[PDB]
């Protein structure tokens, strides 16, 4: 048991791999917890262990309940936490952290079934601290990072070519400050599709200016819940929650994914030096990585054979992240 989670999405098929007579080759077994992968047919077969598989079927609603609502309770306490969106290009990264909006209906008091964990995480928290009596309040910054450097995508008035710099915190060593960076205040529960769709047009013009393209980058979306809970006869708390949704790079590229990896590995095993320092994103995240909260790492994979070499990279990305035992083939 632990604090760090590794958790496996399997997208279902597009149309490319269908007709291109692309075959499925992975085997996902929520019940075992395993991630199967034909390498050869029918001869072998590698198998993976997690803390959970999600298979073709998973709807967000799902990932949402399993993943992130225990972490969003620990956050709601006052605490740091971080999830990750790591794999191939194609695979669903930014559909698990974000989402899409269905274009029949309009859903407004009910959740778009594609939404993803960003909308239903702010949803979550301003229908919790509402219904309880909390005082409370909402920031969001939204960064990116590509080739090991910071583009604000929320600065309503930036210069594209402005990268954030960043300095080192005198009041907590293990934390950093970016200097200029926009943190949007939220004022209601669906303030953030607008906000989602002001970074996406920072994020395209950042592309064609400048071309960090969005596939090749990180994406740091933190929320901060700033919080006053009053109890009479109760107690007085005052707490500062803080998530981080990161959709990272494309797994197909180059170092500072690697380093990503020797962090968690290296707080799994409870080895001495974890290199946070050794990469810009792995400094972002080290006050939510170092005082000891939950991390989940949500690795997405394509089924098709068209991505074999992807998928078994993935995959071995993350059982070296939190190497888990196979449990004995029945
Ligand atoms: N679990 C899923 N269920 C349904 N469609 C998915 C899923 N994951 C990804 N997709 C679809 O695959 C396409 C690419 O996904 P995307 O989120 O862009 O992947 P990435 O962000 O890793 O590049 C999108 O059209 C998306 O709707
Ligand atoms: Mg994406």
Same mark, same amino acid.
């Given at each position: 048991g632990k604090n760090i989670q590794v958790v496996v999405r399997c997208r279902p098929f597009n149309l490319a791999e269908r007709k291109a007579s692309a075959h499925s080759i992975v085997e996902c077994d929520p019940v075992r917890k395993e991630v199967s992968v034909? /390498?050869?047919?029918? $001869?072998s077969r590698k198998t993976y262990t997690f803390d959970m598989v999600f298979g073709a079927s998973t709807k967000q609603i799902d990932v949402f309940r399993s993943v992130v609502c225990p972490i969003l309770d620990e956050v709601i306490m006052g605490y740091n936490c971080t999830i990750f969106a790591y794999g191939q /290009?194609?695979?669903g990264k930014t559909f698990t952290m974000e989402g899409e909006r269905s274009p029949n209906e309009e859903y407004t008091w009910e959740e778009? @079934?594609? %939404?993803?964990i960003i909308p239903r995480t702010l949803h979550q928290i301003f229908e919790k601290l509402t219904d309880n009596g909390t005082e409370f309040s909402v920031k969001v910054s939204l960064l990116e990072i590509y080739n090991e450097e910071l583009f604000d995508?929320?600065? @309503? $008035? $930036?210069?594209? $070519?402005e990268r954030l710099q960043m300095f080192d915190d005198p009041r907590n060593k293990r934390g950093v400050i970016i200097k200029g960076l926009e943190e949007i205040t939220? +004022?209601?529960?669906?303030?953030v599709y607008q906000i989602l769709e002001k970074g996406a047009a920072k994020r395209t013009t950042a592309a064609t200016?400048?071309? %960090?393209?969005s596939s090749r980058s990180h994406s740091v979306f933190s929320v901060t819940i700033h919080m006053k809970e009053t109890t009479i006869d109760g107690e007085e708390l005052v707490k500062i929650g803080k998530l981080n949704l990161v959709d990272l790079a494309?797994?197909?590229?180059?170092?500072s994914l690697l380093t990503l990896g020797r962090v968690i590995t290296a707080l799994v095993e409870r080895? @001495? +030096?974890? @290199?946070?320092?050794?990469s810009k994103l792995t400094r972002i995240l080290q006050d939510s990585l170092g005082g000891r909260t939950r991390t989940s790492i949500i690795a997405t994979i394509s089924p098709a054979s068209l991505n074999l070499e992807e998928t078994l990279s993935t995959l071995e990305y993350a059982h070296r992240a939190k190497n888990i035992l196979n449990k004995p083939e029945v």
């Open positions: 034909r /390498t050869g047919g029918l $001869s /290009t194609g695979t778009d @079934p594609l %939404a993803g995508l929320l600065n @309503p $008035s $930036s210069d594209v $070519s939220v +004022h209601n529960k669906d303030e200016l400048m071309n %960090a393209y494309g797994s197909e590229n180059n170092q080895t @001495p +030096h974890v @290199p946070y320092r050794e």
